[PDB]
């Protein structure tokens, strides 16, 4: 936005949220009137409503960085439900199910962090380190259980969670010199 009347290069404008207006601080011209509360709007996606009574709660938050954009609900039991139709509609989801399956290597990272007592911020860095280096030609053919063992120390080394390489050698697995070279070809990327 830039005031149509004034036009000074550093466009000094204020967001008078309380009056729901966007004003030019110099001439006072209102540049916009429709203005939305982003906090409360975000409350509609990530709420505390797990029961299902909130009429405001109408969407859900996702993580486009880690799981791409895979929107998908799950057939489950409701109040008035026969245990028959749940099974059929779930047995029908089985026929509809390669790299769209290597996302189960996130389940390998998640089950490793929880076995290593690691926080929720470390898993999401280990999952982003693994997604951006598992199909690299720079890693080529490294021990596939030692490149995800190296991306956990990459996620810990940014989230400030102290984990020695010998601490991850105890988890899995690690071949020392094998997951030490792999911890460097990724570090360049």
């Amino acid at each position: 936005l830039t005031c149509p009347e004034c036009k000074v290069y550093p466009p000094k404008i204020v967001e008078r949220f309380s009056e729901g207006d966007v004003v030019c601080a110099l001439c006072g011209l209102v540049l916009s009137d429709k203005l939305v509360d982003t906090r409360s709007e975000w409350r509609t996606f990530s709420n505390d409503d797990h029961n299902g009574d909130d009429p405001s709660r109408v969407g859900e938050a996702s993580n486009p960085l880690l799981d791409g954009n895979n929107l998908s609900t799950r057939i489950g039991k409701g109040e008035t439900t026969d245990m028959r139709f749940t099974k059929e509609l779930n047995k029908a989801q089985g026929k509809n199910v390669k790299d769209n399956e290597v996302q189960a290597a996130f389940a390998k990272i998640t089950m490793l962090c929880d076995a290593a007592e690691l926080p929720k911020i470390v898993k999401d860095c280990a999952k982003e380190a693994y997604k951006l280096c598992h199909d690299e030609k720079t890693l080529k053919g490294k021990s596939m259980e030692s490149i995800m063992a190296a991306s956990i120390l990459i996620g810990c080394r940014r989230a400030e969670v102290a984990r020695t390489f010998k601490e991850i050698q105890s988890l899995i697995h690690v071949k020392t010199k094998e997951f030490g070279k792999t911890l460097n070809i990724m570090k360049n990327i």
Binding site: K12, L65, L66, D124, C125, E128, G155, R158
Partner: protein, 49 residues
């Protein structure tokens, strides 16, 4: 002081009557959004913010 309301000695108020302390506490996190994105504690400059 009609209909449940009431009159109060404004002089008594001055001398300490029914005053109270009030403490509200505001919190904030410096969140980490994945491998690169990190929030920061700082005084924002209006040109680049």
């Amino acid at each position: 002081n009609q209909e449940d309301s009431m009159i109060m000695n404004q002089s008594s108020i001055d001398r300490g009557l029914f005053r109270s302390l009030f403490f509200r506490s505001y919190m904030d996190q410096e969140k980490k959004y994945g491998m690169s994105i990190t929030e920061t504690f700082e005084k924002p400059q209006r040109t680049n913010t």
